Symmetry: D7
Subunit: 110 residues, 14 copies
């Protein structure tokens, strides 16, 4: 029906690399995803919104050069609780760069 194209990437060894475009349907997103990223990482496909404003959730981030998907929770004092890696930690929102919020995920692997 409604074909939609999204820029594709792969995330491996914490390095983000451009890839084939991915064809998806607009029905995948409740909110319109205009500037989006489809990131292929460990058997899953993460749909990212580069326009998203900081808010608790799952995010694509860059921490001192390393790229990854982490769950961010704001703490008082412009701080962040960062989960998703083998061990969670805290830091200032300025110690990290957010590339966008994950709006949806696709997996083939239960």
């Amino acid at each position: 029906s409604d074909a939609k194209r999204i820029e594709g990437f792969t995330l491996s060894e914490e390095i983000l690399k451009s890839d084939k475009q991915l064809s998806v349907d607009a029905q995948f997103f409740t909110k319109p995803l205009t500037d989006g990223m489809a990131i292929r990482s460990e058997g899953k496909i993460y749909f990212v919104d580069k326009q998203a404003s900081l808010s608790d959730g799952l995010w694509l981030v860059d921490i001192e050069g390393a790229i990854s998907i982490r769950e961010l929770t704001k703490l008082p004092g412009r701080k962040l609780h960062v989960a998703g890696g083998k061990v969670p930690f805290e830091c200032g929102i300025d110690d990290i760069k957010t590339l966008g919020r994950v709006v949806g995920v696709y997996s083939e692997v239960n």
Copy 2:
């Protein structure tokens, strides 16, 4: 890049209903998905393979008219362990009808 169209449906109150077709990319499936279904159910989209042969995994099923997504496990004696509902149960593979195997899942809701 490679647009693929799948028949769409919605699953609600255990009733399967046809719906808009869904545009997906072939890169979504490692094994080719020829006769497939895209079922929108509770904020997720399940991709089902109508051609799959019975094997342990996540399935779209019809139990005495009710349609649902359940985890099936074969047990000696042509029996099945059926999980996924509020309470798991057992029954013969002949007491249930399999509509297809879930090959992948898309979710917006973490």
Copy 3:
């Protein structure tokens, strides 16, 4: 905005008694609730769909005359698992009468 009137009742000591009508808005229900009931029971107001078809969920039910709100789960062989009371139990679907499905709940008490 949009005023909607629902027949009201109170449930106490397993007896259903009619009561004042309740004014609600249509925005409370994603699916249209046409033939509905508002049951006041223990500090909560349960909105029920009398038209609902049997499907796993929370139901207003009549068991040998006693009325109650219970979690119903279909088991192969026209059976039911009944939860919600002090001790769950099973029975056949014909041993119980369903009045309707709870589609929403309002509570003041956390």
Copy 4:
């Protein structure tokens, strides 16, 4: 019977947005809800009392611009325990702005 109109809003991505007014019945509230908000958020509707005075309970809050519903508990030293998000935390009552106390919740999703 008794129709009552409340200003309606939606809360999403931690942003509060005005919306359609909601028609409710005064029987919903034991205490009179004069200046109130009906906030639609994730399949639930929260009724907020803007006039409430700080007291332990469920609150609509604004923390450095973010809007959310949190469980507040006063600690000695004008301090607060804030629960409800992925990770609880403490802070001064002056580090957060209270917009109103939740006096009731409607939910369609069990």
Copy 5:
């Protein structure tokens, strides 16, 4: 304000004995308590409705002559789950005699 008199009793060593009448306010009972008992038992006062119809709840009962307060739960097959003593058990509804349902309890001992 509204003085109400209830026949009083004491429960000790599982023997029910008449006692001084008790003066209570009608405001103590949401539903009217017409034929009631006030049973003093172990630092508490149980208010009992002799007219109650069997329903899941806390009841004053007589089991083979012994009088006690038990939590009763109906089970399929005219059966009962009886809790409240040191060890819960099951039996037929005909194996026990109900004297009334507790509608309220007063206690001075936290």
Copy 6:
């Protein structure tokens, strides 16, 4: 038998408010309750002894204007452990005002 009148109040949103007098029997209290209060709070009625001398127990208190029922425990150094709220805490006996001790509780809600 013996009718006794006690001043009634309701406690809600941490505010105490006078209300209907309540009629109670003297048999409710082992020790004489001369200057008492009956506080209606969350489906229960607390009987308070304004004359009580500080001693570990359940009290009606006033902390910086907020009124509540809390379990107090004296700690060396004129200090107090205050429980009952979502999160317990300590403080000096002079940082809280005691209105009276709960000598009994009536409830209809198990």
Copy 7:
């Protein structure tokens, strides 16, 4: 003040042996203990009421000749749950002889 004499015994290796009379005060017992025993067993003195009628509680018993103190709980069918020994068990009330109920216990060992 009020001196009271009770026949004394010792219980050891499940054998009841007569012993010195024990002088106690009537204030020890809320109900009058007319025909009583004072049984010295493992550092404690149990006060038994030989006239007690069977009721759930702590009993001095004789099972197939062996004497011991057990917690008895009546079960439907003239049955008993017998706890207190290394492993509890059930039996009929006729399989055991009750010598009296323990109405009080004195201990020097915490």
Copy 8:
């Protein structure tokens, strides 16, 4: 046989009050109890030795005027662990006044 009189008291709301003398048999105490107290508190009688020298155990104490029965444990640095109340705490031995050690306890309430 051997009648022994002990001065009696009652402990309530943390206030010790003289009462009727209690008649007890010397067989109750392995060590001779010369200057003793019999404290009636919450359905139990505590036998206290006023002569006891500080040692870990159950004690009758006076903490800033409040009288209670507490479990005392000496800690290095003339400190004490005080247990028995709703919340245990530590303090210096000089912050508490010991009135005597509990040598035995009688109870009618299992």
Copy 9:
């Protein structure tokens, strides 16, 4: 002071074997131990009373020829619960032969 000699044995691989006499003092036993055994087993020395009458406790037994120390508990029906080995079990009192009851235990190994 008071020397007492007891016939000694060692118990190994479930075989009882006579050995050196063991010199013990009578103060070791509250009850006189006239006909006793001193059994050396796995770094411990069990003192056994060959004259003891069956009663719940620790015994030296002979089961189908195997000798061991077990915890015996009488069950209704001339039955016994036998614990102490890797897996407890039940049997009639006539399926086992009791050699004596352990009245005390000496150990070097904590």
Copy 10:
């Protein structure tokens, strides 16, 4: 066989007191117990070696005049962890006086 005499004592209320000599066989001790104590405490008899050199284990100790049996564990910095009483604690090796090490324990009470 081999009679051995040890100086006996009783430990009660943290006071050590001389007592009857105890006759024991040398077979009780793997290492020779030359200068030993037999301490009767709470139904057990502790054999202590006054000559033992400090090492982790069970010890008879003297702390600010109080005598007790404690489990001692060396911690770097000439420190000790003291266990055995209701609440463990640490201190310096010089804050406690050791009287001997427990080498064996006899008990009649399981």
Copy 11:
């Protein structure tokens, strides 16, 4: 150094299918793997010994046509416990066909 060639296969949806040979070193196996299979299944490579004699361990099996890797444990009565799938079960050794025992496993995915 020592190149070794093993017949390769893939196991997917319980179907075993031949594939590219796999080159391995003899140093991967302590016991010589003469007739072996290298089966690729879910990101892991299983090395199977077709000649193995039944013994508890991990096995490549065929149950009613379905192919899988399972942990087998012999039970008295020519029986087998089969683990590895979502729900273990038992069956006769003749209800299953063993294809070989897994001697080693290679994984890339931790």
Copy 12:
């Protein structure tokens, strides 16, 4: 089919020692393993990529001369969490030397 030669080593007592080369197929590695090591350690064979860039994962490391396989997790501030040994710890990324990432493990011991 496709033979590949990898330098081999053994890791024992934290010392890495050269050993026989290992023949492996390229099918073992999704990504090309150009400069690889095969580390034999405690019954397993670790395949390491000497050119891997620092990224969260399993690594072969050299800490102050000691060589081991550890799970590394980057923490803000050029820090690392090091797991795998008996007790995890943190340190700067420069306090450790990374020799390569483990991309695969072969094991014979389940």
Copy 13:
């Protein structure tokens, strides 16, 4: 000092195979081990006594041809509880053949 030779074997895949003799010292066994086996099995060496008579313990056994090391426990009725494998089971002592009792174990692997 005292060199002792023992017949060696290896146990693998449930097959017992003769091997190099092992040289051990007689100090390894408290009881003399005259005809003994040293079974190397999974990094440990089990020393077996072929002359042992049945008794609860760890045994080298032969079950329908399979050789293994199991914990045996005698049950009434000439039965055995057999533990050590993935799943314990029972059977008659005549359904199993005992080769010897393990008297000691040596391990290099913690």
Copy 14:
């Protein structure tokens, strides 16, 4: 077969004492044990390698004169975690003297 002599010792009360040589077989050690010790301690024999270089493991140590077997773990900052005694602790590598690493253990006591 291959006899090997090792210097023997006994470890008791934390004192190390030379003893008879122990004859073992070289097959006990995968790595050659040239300068080794056989330490008899608590019914077990520890085989120690005096030449071992510091690495995580079980060690024979000397802490301020005291000799024991402890589990050592290196921590950043030339520190050690020391386990094995009743309470683990930390300290610098220089606060402890290592005598050798345990390479194997023999035990008769399960």
